[PDB]
Amino acid sequence: IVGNGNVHAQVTAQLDFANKEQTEEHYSPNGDASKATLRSRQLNISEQVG
Amino acid sequence: DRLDAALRFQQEALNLRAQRQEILAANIANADTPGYQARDIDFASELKKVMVGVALTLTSSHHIPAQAVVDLLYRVPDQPSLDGNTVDMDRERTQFADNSLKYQMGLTVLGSQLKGMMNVLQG
C-alpha cells in the first residue's frame, strides 16, 4: 500500500535470558459440606434432658 | 489369643465380683433413702453369660477403627419398713464380706496362674 522505500521501520526487543523454574501446588477448598470428600467420620451425639 | 482363653474365666470372675461389690456398697450407701429397692445380681448366671465383637473393617490409615461402648435383680424383702426401704443391714453386710473374700480369692488364683506361666518362661 505505501510502496517500496516509502516505509522504514526499526524494532528493539527487551528479551528474557533468566532461567526460571517454578512448581505450583493448588488445593481445592473443602469448607462446604457439599463438595467435601470424606474417608472416615465419627459423630458422637448426646442429649441428656432433665 | 490362647493366653486370653486361659485367663478369661478368672478375669471375668474378678470383674463380676468387683461389679457386685459396687452394687452391694450402693445398697449400703442408699440404706436411708425412702423408696429405694435393694438390687443385686445373680453371680453364676451372669458369669455364664459373660463367658459364653465384630471390629469394623479399616481399609486404609485415615479410616477410623470401630469404637466400643448385666441385669439387676431385686432382693426379696425380709422386714416391711414404713418408708419403703427394703435394704437389710445384716444380709448385705454378710454378702459384702463374702464378696470381698471371693475377690481376694480370685486375685490369688489369677496371680498364681500368671506366676506359673512366668516361671515356665524364666531361665
Neighbour-count burial of B28, counting CB atoms closer than 10 A to its CB (0-12 exposed, 13-18 middle, 19+ buried): middle
Whether A40 and B67 lie within 8 Å, measured CB to CB: no
The experimental method is cryo-EM
Question: How many residues are present in chain B?
Answer: 123
Q: How far is CA B14 from CA A2, B18, B51, B118, B119, in A?
A: 110, 6, 12, 20, 23
Q: Where are the beta strands (DSSP E) in B1-123?
A: 39-40, 73-74
Q: Which residues contact B79 (CB under 8 A, 6 or more apart)?
A: B88
3-state class (DSSP) for residue B41: coil
**What does the longest C-alpha to C-alpha distance in chain A come to?**
101
Q: B109 φ, ψ to 5°?
A: -65, -45
Question: How many residues are present in chain A?
Answer: 50
Distance from CA of B71 to the nearest CA of A (A): 23
Q: How far is CA A20 from CA A14, A15, A16, A24, A26, in A?
A: 17, 14, 10, 13, 20
Whole-angstrom distance, CA of residue B108 vs CA of residue B70: 25
Q: B74 φ, ψ to 5°?
A: -70, 140
Neighbour-count burial of B52, counting CB atoms closer than 10 A to its CB (0-12 exposed, 13-18 middle, 19+ buried): exposed
Q: Which residues contact B63 (CB under 8 A, 6 or more apart)?
A: A39, A40, B57
Q: Is B60 on the interface with A (CB under 8 A)?
A: yes
Whether A39 and B67 lie within 8 Å, measured CB to CB: no
Residue B62 is which amino acid? H
Let me know: does B42 contact B73? Beta carbons within 8 Å: yes
Stated resolution in angstroms: 3.8
Q: Which three cell numbers stand for residue A41?
A: 467420620
3-state class (DSSP) for residue B73: strand
Q: How far is CA B13 from CA A13, A49, B3, B52, B107, in A?
A: 92, 36, 16, 13, 10
Q: Is A37 on the interface with B (CB under 8 A)?
A: no
Neighbour-count burial of B12, counting CB atoms closer than 10 A to its CB (0-12 exposed, 13-18 middle, 19+ buried): middle
Whether A41 and B60 lie within 8 Å, measured CB to CB: no
